[PDB]
Ligand binder design. Structure first.
Ligand SMILES: Nc1nc2c(ncn2[C@@H]2O[C@H](COP(=O)(O)OP(=O)(O)OP(=O)(O)O)[C@@H](O)[C@H]2O)c(=O)[nH]1
Ligand SMILES: Nc1nc2c(ncn2[C@@H]2O[C@H](COP(=O)(O)OP(=O)(O)OP(=O)(O)O)[C@@H](O)[C@H]2O)c(=O)[nH]1
Ligand SMILES: Nc1nc2c(ncn2[C@@H]2O[C@H](COP(=O)(O)OP(=O)(O)O)[C@@H](O)[C@H]2O)c(=O)[nH]1
Ligand SMILES: [Mg+2]
Ligand SMILES: [Mg+2]
Lengths: 442, 430, 227, 41, 48, 80, 442
C-alpha cells in the first residue's frame, strides 16, 4: 500500500514538482489540500492512500521529502502555487551547494544535513502500516545529487532492511554536456550506487529531447516537458498499486523478474503513446501498435541502442482498456522478430501487467488523451556501451590528473579514483562474459 | 457429502469469485445470503457447498489466503463479496514477489498455522467430510508456495480423504513471468507426491476457446474464469442432484488413475457455441460427444493425436437415455482404436444426472488421462535445465536459503515422470 | 474519476469544477443550471440585437463570477480559448451549449426517449398546465414544475436532467429512474418487467394455461386384475 | 427485472461494459494494524 | 463503444488547443514578428 | 477486422428472382445473376462482419412451468 | 485484399495525386476523410479496405507513402486540397535533390534517407492482415527515382521476401528527351531492376502525347492528363480485388502467367476506350470493337511496335457490361490475325479477367463516359528495340567518358558502367535466344 518518495537536488526536486502536480490531479486533491465538495463518506474513496495521508481535520499531505543544499529551488516551491499542500517541515534546505563536487557533498556538507533527513524519513515511516519501498529521484552528474544521494541510500540501507529501493536516474548524455567534471562524479556515484540499489532505471535528457522533437511537435523544448514525461512514466508504473486491474504487480516483483545476477540491475525505460493531439486524430491507437512502439529505440528515454546487445528480461505494463488476448498476441508477435534477440539462457523473457485506469490529462499538457497506454522497463547487455563511453572519458581526464586537487582538498583520498575505476572495469567484464552463448562454453 | 474449497493467490481468488457466483446462482442464493430459489430440489442438497447459518443466511465453506490483501479487497468489494465469512480471510503484510522460496519458507510458515486453524475449524464442523478442492496457479509465488505447503499439511492431517487441485500452468508460447520454470518444477515435484488428482489449464488454450469457438470480440478474464467455474461446478454436479447412474469423486479417482503417479488429467466442456451458430444445430448426444472429443474444446496445449488415452470419464447432465450414451462411448472407442491403450478393455466411464444447468437442455463435462501431457513437462524441464546451467536468477532462491539439491531432486523426479509416461505409451503385451 | 474514465470521455477537470460551482451555489441546483442557460441565451440575444456577433470573454467570466465560480490563475483564459473557435475574442454558443448539457450516450438516449414520450404542440414545445395533473403522482423530483418559465423546451429539459445525473452513479439506474419517472416505457418494446406488455399474437414461450401433466394421459382403468 | 440481466449465467452471455464500474480504486477493507486482522466493510 | 471514441475526439478538439500549451511563447511561429527591437528611436523608455 | 466496430453486413436486393415470383427455375432464366439486376457491385467481407438484429427481448425466462388454537383448559365440543 | 503503394520522386508523387483522387471518388471517401455530423459510419461497406483504413471514430486514411528528396512537391501535397486525408508522417521530404545522378541517390543521399522510408513502410505493413504486394510508381530517368527506387527495392526484397513487387516505370522516350544524362541512369536502373522486380510495366510520355492528340481532342496537353490516364490504368488492374465479377485475378496471378524466365519480366501496356465525348456518341462500343482496338499500336502507352516481335503471354482485363461468349469470340478472332504471332513454345497465350464495375467519371476529366473498357499487359520480344537504342546512346557517350567524373565523385566506381553494359547486352541476347523457333532448332 504505501510508498515513500525521496527527491534529491535540482533535477529531482523539479521532477518531483511535476510528479506531485500529476498525482494531485489524478487523485483529485486540490492545491490547498482539500477533497472536492462532492466526495464524502457516501462512497469508498481511499486510492490516494498510496501517496497521501489525511490529518484529523481531513486535509491531505503527501508522503514525500524534498532535499537540496541550495535554497533557490525549494524556496520556489515554498513561494509557488502548492504552498499550502506541503508541510513546511518536509522542505529542507541548506546554505550552499556542492559546486559539482561529489567529495564536497559526501564528506563536507551532506554529513551535516543527513541526520535531519533520516529523522524526517523515520517520522514518515512511523505513520505507515504497509510501506513497501522507496522511490528515489536524483541526478548523478551534480555534486549534491551524487554525494548526498549515495550517503542517504547507505544510511537508509543500514537502518531499514529487506526493503526495495528503485531509482530513476538522469545520467550524463553521450555528447550533450553541462559540466566539465561529469565523468568523475558519474563514476564515483555509480560505484557507491552499485552496492545499495535493487533496480536502477536510466534516463538521458538528450534522448527525451529527441523524443519530444520526433513524436511531439515542439521545436524548442524545455525541462518542464521532460519532467511531465517522467511523471507520466512513474504514474504508469505505480498505477498497478492504486487501481483495479486484471494483473497487478508489486514493486518487489520488478526486482525478481529483471535482475538475473546481483550486479546486473540497470534497466531501459520506454513509453508508447507519446503523441500530439493533431497526430492522434490521424491514427487508431490499438494494443499491438503501442506494443510495437515500446520496442523501437526511438521510444527510449536513455541514449543507448539495444540492437548492440541482447535482452535478458522485459516487463510490460498495460493500463487502460486492454483485453488479455491482445496482450498475448502482441507479445507473441514481438517474439517472432529476428532483430530482437534474447540470451539463450532466458527462454521465458516476459512479465505482463494489466490495469484498468487510463492515463490522466493535465490542463497545459502536450500529450493527447488516450484510452490505453503501455510502459516498458527492460534489462539488456547494451548498457555496457554507456559505461564504456563514460570510462573512456574518465581515462582521458585522469591520465593528466586534470582536476584531482579539488577532490583531494575537499576530503577524499586519491585512491578512491582507482578503486571506482577498477570496479567499473569489473562491471564491463561481467557484461562481456554474461552475453557469451552456452553452446560455445560447452 | 460436503466439499471444502481453498482459494490461494490472485488467480485463485479471482477464479473463486466466479465459481461462488455460479454456485450461488444454481442454488438460488441471493448475494445477501437469502434463499430465493424456485424448487425444493435446490434446497435438499444445499449443504454440499454451503454451511447453514442461524437466521435467513447461508455461509460458504471456503478459506481465502493471500500475502497482500489487494485482491481480497477487490473481491470483498465485489457484488457477491458480502456472502463470505469475515473471519475466513487470512493475510500477511508483504507480497510473495512471485518467488517460491519466500512464499514457502518465510511468510508461508508465518501464516500456515492460522490457515490450518481455519481449515480444521471448518473440517471438524462437517458431519461427514469429502475431499478438499484447491485452486491456484503454479507459475506464481504465494499460489505455488503456500498452496503446496497447505496441501502437504492437509495430506499429513487428512490422509484418508481425497485431494483434488485445479492448477494454472505456463503457456508454451508466451510467458507471464520470467522465473516460471523454477516455480513450476518445484510445485509439480510437490504435487506428484502429495496430490490424488490434478487438472491443468493453459490460458493460451482458453484464448483459443474464446477466439475460435465463442468468437468473442473483446473477452475478459471473467469469461475465462466462467469457463473454469463451469467445468469445476460440473464435475461435482452428480454429487448434489439425483440421477440414473450416480458418481462420486472417489469413484472417479478409482476409475481414472491406473498407477499413483499417473494422476494428471485434461478437461473439457461441450455446449460452447457462438451466438451466430446456435440456429444451425440442435442439441443431441452425438453432437455433445463430437464436441467432447474435439481438441479445439480441450483446455491444454498438448494434442491427443501424439499420445494415447489410458482412461477417460464423461458426466452427462440432462434428461436422456442410457442407450445413446453407452453406444456413443463404444463407437468413439471402436472408431479411434489406435489412440486408446490396448491392454485396457474399456477406457471410458459414463455418468448421467437429471438436472442440467439453467438455460441449457443438456451438458457434459469431460476429464481425460492422456500420455501427451508428457511433452508439456518435457518442455518445462528443458527450460529449467537451460536456466540452471547458467544459474539463472538463482541468487534470489539461494539467498532465501534453499539447497541446490532440492532443484536437482525436483528436476530428476520430473524427468523420471516423463520417462514413465513414454514407457507406458510404447508398452506392448508381447 | 468522472473526467478520467473511459465511460465519460468528454469531461474536463476545470469545466467540471465550473459546473460544480454553478450547481452547488446558493432554488436548487438544476434550477440554477436552467437559469444559467437562460441568461446565456438572453445575453447572446441582446448582443445580436446590438450588432455584435457574440458574447465576449469579459462578460463570460463576469457571468461565471456572478454565479459564484472561485476561479484560479490562468483557468479563465483557458476556458476563453477553449470555446473560441475563430480566435477573435468571442465565445461560440453551440459548442458551449453542447458541452454544458453534456451526457453519456446511454443517458442521452434515455433523455431523448423520455422527451419523445411527452406530447407537444405549436413549435415543438410543452406546457405545464396541460400535463401537471396527469403526472402529478409519479414525478418524485418536483422541481420540474419550478423549471417551467408554464412552458419549456428541449434544451432546458436536457440541462435539468443532466444536472441530476451526478446523484445516480449507475447508468442503468438512471435509465430506469427516468423511464418510471415519465412513464416512457413502450408497450411494444419494453425494458422493464413491471409493465403491461402487449404482443398482438402472444409470447412465443407461452407456457401458461396448460401445466401438461403425464398422469392425465395414462389409462388407469386398464390396470385392473381380471381373468 | 430488466432485459439487461434476464439471461442465464452461461459462457458468452456476459456483457461486461454494460455494467461499468463508477470507480476503479482499491479500498482498505482488509488491514493488519498491530497484528489483529480486520476485514471491516 | 463507437460513440465513446467520437466523444473522446470532441474532447481533444475542444480542450487541447495548440495555443493553450504553457510553452506557447517559445514554440510560437511569428515570434520575431510580435517582438520589439532593443531600442526604438531616441526616447525609448526601455533603454536604461 | 480492425475497422470501426459499428459496421454490419450490408443489405443486397437481387431483384428479378424467379422463385420469388411464382415461376419455375427454368433453364436460361437466371435473371438474378445479371449485373443489371443488382444495386451495387462492392465486395464486402461478410465472413468477418456480424449481422443486424432488431427485436424487443422477453425480459424474463421461466424454468419451472409456472406452477388461537392453543389449549388452556376449557374443552368445548362443536359438531361441525 | 490490401495493397500498399509507394510513390517516389516527382513523377511518382504527381501520378499519386491523380490515383488517390480517383480511388477516393470511386469508393466515396470525402477529400478530407471526415463524415457528415449525423452519420455513425461514413460508408455502409468495407470495400475501401484494399486502399484505405478507417479509425475507430470513422476517419479514413490511405495506405501510401510519398518519398522525395526535394521538399517542393511534397509541400504542395501538404498545402493542397487533400491535406487532411494523409497522415503527416507518410509525406517524407529531404533537403536537396539527387541532381540527376544515380550515384548521388544510391550511395550518398538515398542511403541516408532510406531507413526512415523502411520504418514508415513497416508501420503500414504491421497494420495489415492479408498483404499481397507492393505497387511502385517512379521514373528511371531522374536521379532520386532511379537511385533510391533501386536501393529501396533491394532492401524491400531482403526484408519482405516472397511478397510481389509490381512497378510502373516511366522510361526515356525514344526521341523526346528532357536531360542529357538519361542513358546512364536508365542503364544502371535497369541493371538493378532485373534482379529485384517481379513485373515491370513501361510507359513513355511520347506515346501518351500521341494518344491524347489522336483520340482525345487536346491541342496543348500537360502532365495532369497523362497522370489521369495512368491512374485509370492502375484502377482497372486493381479493380479485380475490389468489386464483384465473373473471373477475378489476384495480383500473384500476373507474375505466374506473364513471366516465362526470371529475367523476362518487362511488359507493354495499352487501354482501349480512350475516347473524347464528341466521338463517344457517334459510335457504338461493343466488346469486339475494343478487343480489336487493344492490339492496334495507336492504343499503346509505350512507344514500341509489337508487329516487329513475338508475343509470349497476354493478360486481358475486361471491366463493365461484358458477356463471356463475346470475349471468347473476340479473342478467337484476334488469334486469327496474321500480324499477331506467338512463339511456338507458348500455345496457351492468354489469361482473361471479367469485372462488373464500369469505369468511374472524374469531375474535371477529359475521358467520355462508357459502359465497358478493357486493359492489356503483354510480354513481347519487340521490347529489345528500346534497350538497343538506349545502349547505343550509352556507348556513344561512354567512348569518351563524357560525364563520368560526376558519378565517380558521388561515390561510384567506373567499373559499374562497363558491368551494367554487359548485363544489358546479355539481356539483348536473351531476347534473341528466347525468340528462336523450336521447329528451326529441330
Ligand atoms: N530532466 C531534467 N534534467 C535536469 C533538470 N535540472 C537539471 N538537469 C540535468 O542534471 C544535470 C545537472 O545536475 P543538477 O541537478 O543541477 O546538480 P545538483 O544536484 O544541483 O548538484 P549541485 O550543483 O552541486 O547543487 C545536467 O545534466 C542537467 O541537464 C531537470 O529539471 N530535468
Ligand atoms: N508521365 C509523367 N512523366 C513525368 C512527370 N514528371 C516528370 N516526368 C518525367 O520523368 C523524368 C524526370 O524525372 P523526375 O521525376 O523529374 O526526377 P526526380 O525523381 O525528381 O529526380 P531528381 O531530379 O534527382 O530530383 C522526365 O522524363 C520527365 O518527363 C509526370 O508527372 N508524369
Ligand atoms: N486464467 C486466469 N489466469 C490468471 C488469473 N490471474 C492471474 N492469472 C495467471 O496466473 C499467473 C500469475 O500468477 P499469480 O496469481 O499472480 O501468482 P501469485 O503472485 O502467487 O498470486 C499468470 O500466468 C497469470 O496470467 C485469472 O483470473 N485467470
Ligand atoms: Mg544544485
Ligand atoms: Mg526532383
Amino acid at each position: 500500500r504505501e510508498a515513500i518518495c525521496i527527491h534529491i537536488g535540482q533535477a529531482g526536486c523539479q521532477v518531483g514538482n511535476a510528479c506531485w502536480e500529476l498525482f494531485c490531479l489524478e487523485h483529485g486533491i486540490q492545491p490547498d489540500g482539500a477533497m472536492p465538495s462532492d466526495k464524502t463518506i457516501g462512497v469508498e474513496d481511499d486510492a490516494f492512500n498510496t501517496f497521501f495521508s489525511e490529518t484529523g481535520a481531513g486535509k491531505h499531505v503527501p508522503r514525500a521529502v524534498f532535499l537540496d543544499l541550495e535554497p533557490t529551488v525549494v524556496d520556489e516551491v515554498r513561494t509557488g502555487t502548492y504552498r499550502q499542500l506541503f508541510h513546511p517541515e518536509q522542505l529542507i534546505s541548506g546554505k550552499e551547494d556542492a559546486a559539482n563536487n561529489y567529495a564536497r557533498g559526501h564528506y563536507t556538507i551532506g554529513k551535516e544535513i543527513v541526520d535531519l533527513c533520516l529523522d524526517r524519513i523515520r517520522k514518515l515511516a512511523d505513520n505507515c502500516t504497509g510501506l513497501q519501498g522507496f522511490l528515489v529521484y536524483h541526478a548523478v552528474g551534480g555534486g549534491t545529487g551524487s554525494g548526498l544521494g549515495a550517503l542517504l541510500l547507505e544510511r537508509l540501507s543500514v537502518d531499514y532492511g529487506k526493503k526495495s529501493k528503485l531509482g530513476y536516474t538522469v545520467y550524463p548524455s553521450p555528447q550533450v554536456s553541462t559540466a566539465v567534471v561529469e565523468p568523475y562524479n558519474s563514476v564515483l556515484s555509480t560505484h557507491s550506487l552499485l552496492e545499495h540499489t535493487d533496480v536502477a532505471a536510466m534516463l538521458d535528457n538528450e534522448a527525451i529531447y529527441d523524443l519530444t522533437r520526433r513524436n511531439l511537435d515542439i521545436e524548442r523544448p524545455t525541462y518542464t516537458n521532460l519532467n511531465r514525461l517522467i511523471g507520466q512514466v512513474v504514474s504508469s508504473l505505480t498505477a498497478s498499486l492504486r487501481f483495479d486491474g486484471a494483473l497487478n504487480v508489486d514493486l518487489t516483483e520488478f526486482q525478481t523478474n529483471l535482475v538475473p545476477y546481483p550486479r546486473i540491475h540497470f534497466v531501459l525505460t520506454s513509453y508508447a503513446p507519446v503523441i500530439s493531439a493533431e497526430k492522434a486524430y490521424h491514427e487508431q491507437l490499438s494494443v499491438s501498435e503501442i506494443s510495437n512502439a515500446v520496442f523501437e529505440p526511438a521510444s527510449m528515454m536513455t541514449k543507448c541502442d539495444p540492437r548492440h546487445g541482447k535482452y535478458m528480461a522485459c516487463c510490460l505494463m498495460y493500463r487502460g482498456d486492454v483485453v488479455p488476448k491482445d496482450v498475448n498476441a502482441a507479445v507473441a508477435t514481438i517474439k517472432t522478430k529476428r532483430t530482437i534477440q534474447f540470451v539463450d539462457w532466458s527462454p521465458t523473457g516476459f512479465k505482463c501487467g494489466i490495469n484498468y485506469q487510463p492515463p490522466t490529462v493535465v490542463p497545459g499538457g502536450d500529450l493527447a488523451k488516450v484510452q490505453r497506454a503501455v510502459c516498458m522497463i527492460a534489462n539488456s547487455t547494451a548498457i555496457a556501451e554507456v559505461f564504456a563511453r563514460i570510462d573512456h572519458k574518465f581515462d582521458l581526464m585522469y591520465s593528466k590528473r586534470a582536476f584531482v586537487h579539488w577532490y583531494v582538498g575537499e576530503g577524499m583520498e586519491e585512491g578512491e579514483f582507482s578503486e571506482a575505476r577498477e570496479d567499473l572495469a569489473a562491471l564491463e567484464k561481467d557484461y562481456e562474459e554474461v552475453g557469451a552463448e552456452s553452446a560455445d562454453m560447452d | 457429502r460436503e466439499i471444502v474449497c481453498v482459494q490461494a493467490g490472485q488467480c485463485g481468488n479471482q477464479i473463486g469469485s466466479k465459481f461462488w457466483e455460479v454456485i450461488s446462482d444454481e442454488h438460488g442464493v441471493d448475494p445477501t445470503g437469502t434463499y430465493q430459489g424456485d424448487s425444493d430440489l435446490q434446497l435438499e442438497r444445499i449443504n454440499v457447498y454451503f454451511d447453514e447459518a442461524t437466521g435467513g443466511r447461508y455461509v460458504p465453506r471456503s478459506v481465502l489466503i493471500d500475502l497482500e490483501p489487494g485482491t481480497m479487497d477487490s473481491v470483498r468489494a465485489g457484488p457477491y463479496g458480502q456472502i463470505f465469512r469475515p473471519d475466513n480471510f487470512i493475510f500477511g503484510q508483504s507480497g510473495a514477489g512471485n518467488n517460491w522460496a519466500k512464499g514457502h519458507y518465510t511468510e508461508g510458515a508465518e501464516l500456515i498455522d492460522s490457515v490450518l486453524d481455519v481449515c480444521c475449524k471448518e473440517a471438524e464442523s462437517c458431519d461427514c467430510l469429502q475431499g478438499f478442492q484447491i485452486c491456484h496457479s503454479l507459475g506464481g509465488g504465494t499460489g505455488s508456495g503456500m498452496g503446496t505447503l497447505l496441501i502437504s499439511k492437509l495430506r499429513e492431517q487428512y490422509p484418508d480423504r481425497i485431494m483434488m487441485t485445479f492448477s494454472i500452468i505456463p503457456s508454451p508460447k508466451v510467458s507471464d513471468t520470467v522465473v516460471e520454470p523454477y516455480n513450476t518444477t518445484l510445485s509439480v515435484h510437490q504435487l506428484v507426491e502429495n496430490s490424488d488428482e490434478s487438472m491443468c489449464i493453459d490460458n493460451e488454450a482458453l484464448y483459443d476457446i474464446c477466439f475460435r469457438t465463442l468468437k468473442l470480440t473483446t473477452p475478459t478474464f471473467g469469461d475465462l474464469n466462467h469457463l473454469v467455474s463451469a467445468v469445476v461446478s460440473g464435475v461435482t454436479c452428480c454429487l448434489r442432484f439425483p440421477g440414473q447412474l450416480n458418481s462420486d469423486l472417489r469413484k472417479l479417482a478409482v476409475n481414472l488413475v491406473p498407477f499413483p503417479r499417473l494422476h494428471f488429467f485434461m478437461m473439457g466442456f461441450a455446449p460452447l457455441t457462438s451466438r451466430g451458430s446456435q440456429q444451425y444445430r440442435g442439441l443431441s448426444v452425438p453432437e455433445l460427444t463430437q464436441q467432447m472429443f474435439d481438441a479445439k474444446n480441450m483446455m491444454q496445449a498438448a494434442d491427443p493425436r501424439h499420445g494415447r488415452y489410458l482412461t477417460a470419464s464423461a458426466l452427462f447432465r440432462g434428461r436422456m437415455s442410457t442407450k445413446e450414451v453407452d453406444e456413443q462411448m463404444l463407437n468413439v472407442q471402436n472408431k479411434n482404436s489406435s489412440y486408446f491403450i490396448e491392454w485396457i478393455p474399456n477406457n471410458i466411464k459414463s455418468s448421467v444426472c437429471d438436472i442440467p444447468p439453467k438455460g441449457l437442455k443438456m451438458a457434459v463435462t469431460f476429464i481425460g488421462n492422456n500420455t501427451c501431457i508428457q511433452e508439456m513437462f518435457r518442455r518445462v524441464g528443458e527450460q529449467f535445465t537451460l536456466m540452471f546451467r547458467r544459474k539463472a536468477f538463482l541468487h534470489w532462491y539461494t539467498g532465501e536459503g534453499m539447497d541446490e539439491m532440492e532443484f536437482t531432486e525436483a528436476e530428476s523426479n520430473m524427468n523420471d515422470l516423463v520417462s514413465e509416461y513414454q514407457q507406458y505409451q510404447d508398452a506392448t503385451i508381447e | 474519476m468522472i473526467y478520467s474514465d473511459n465511460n465519460n470521455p468528454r469531461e474536463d477537470s476545470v469545466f467540471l469544477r465550473v459546473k460544480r460551482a454553478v450547481r452547488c451555489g446558493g432554488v436548487t441546483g438544476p434550477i440554477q443550471m436552467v437559469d444559467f442557460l437562460r441568461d446565456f441565451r438572453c445575453l447572446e440575444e441582446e448582443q445580436r440585437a446590438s450588432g455584435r456577433k457574440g458574447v465576449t470573454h469579459k462578460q463570460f467570466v463576469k457571468l461565471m463570477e456572478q454565479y459564484g465560480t472561485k476561479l484560479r490563475e490562468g483557468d479563465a483564459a483557458y476556458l476563453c480559448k477553449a470555446f473560441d473557435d475563430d480566435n477573435d475574442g468571442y465565445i461560440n454558443p453551440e459548442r458551449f451549449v453542447r458541452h454544458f448539457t453534456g451526457l453519456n450516450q446511454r443517458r442521452h438516449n434515455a433523455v431523448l426517449r423520455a422527451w419523445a414520450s411527452l406530447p407537444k404542440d405549436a413549435k415543438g414545445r410543452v406546457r405545464r398546465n396541460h400535463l401537471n395533473e396527469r403526472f402529478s403522482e409519479t414525478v418524485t423530483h418536483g422541481d420540474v414544475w419550478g423549471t417551467f418559465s408554464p412552458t419549456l423546451c428541449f434544451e432546458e429539459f436536457l440541462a435539468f436532467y443532466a444536472a441530476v445525473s451526478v446523484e445516480i452513479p449507475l447508468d442503468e439506474k438512471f435509465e430506469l429512474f427516468l423511464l418510471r419517472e415519465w412513464c416512457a416505457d413502450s408497450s411494444r418494446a419494453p425494458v422493464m418487467n413491471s409493465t403491461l406488455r402487449e404482443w398482438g399474437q402472444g409470447g412465443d414461450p407461452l407456457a401458461i394455461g396448460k401445466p401438461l401433466y403425464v398422469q392425465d394421459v395414462l389409462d388407469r382403468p386398464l390396470g385392473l386384475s381380471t381373468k | 427485472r430488466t432485459i439487461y440481466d434476464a439471461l442465464p449465467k452461461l459462457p458468452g452471455f456476459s456483457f461486461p461494459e454494460l455494467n461499468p464500474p463508477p470507480t476503479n480504486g482499491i479500498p482498505q477493507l482488509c488491514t493488519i494494524r498491530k497484528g489483529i486482522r480486520t476485514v471491516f466493510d | 463503444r463507437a460513440n465513446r471514441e467520437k466523444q473522446l475526439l470532441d474532447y481533444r478538439e475542444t480542450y487541447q488547443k495548440k495555443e493553450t500549451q504553457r510553452e506557447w511563447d517559445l514554440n510560437d511561429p511569428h515570434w520575431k514578428a510580435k517582438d520589439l527591437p532593443g531600442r526604438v528611436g531616441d526616447n525609448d523608455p526601455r533603454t536604461g | 477486422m480492425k475497422n470501426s466496430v459499428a459496421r454490419t453486413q450490408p443489405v443486397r436486393k437481387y431483384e428479378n428472382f424467379t422463385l420469388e415470383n411464382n415461376l419455375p427455375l427454368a433453364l436460361g432464366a437466371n435473371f438474378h445473376d445479371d449485373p443489371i439486376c443488382r444495386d451495387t457491385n462492392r465486395t464486402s467481407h461478410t465472413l468477418l462482419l456480424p449481422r443486424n438484429v432488431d427485436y424487443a427481448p422477453h425480459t424474463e425466462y421461466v424454468f419451472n412451468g409456472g406452477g388461537e388454537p392453543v389449549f388452556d383448559g376449557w374443552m368445548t365440543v362443536n359438531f361441525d
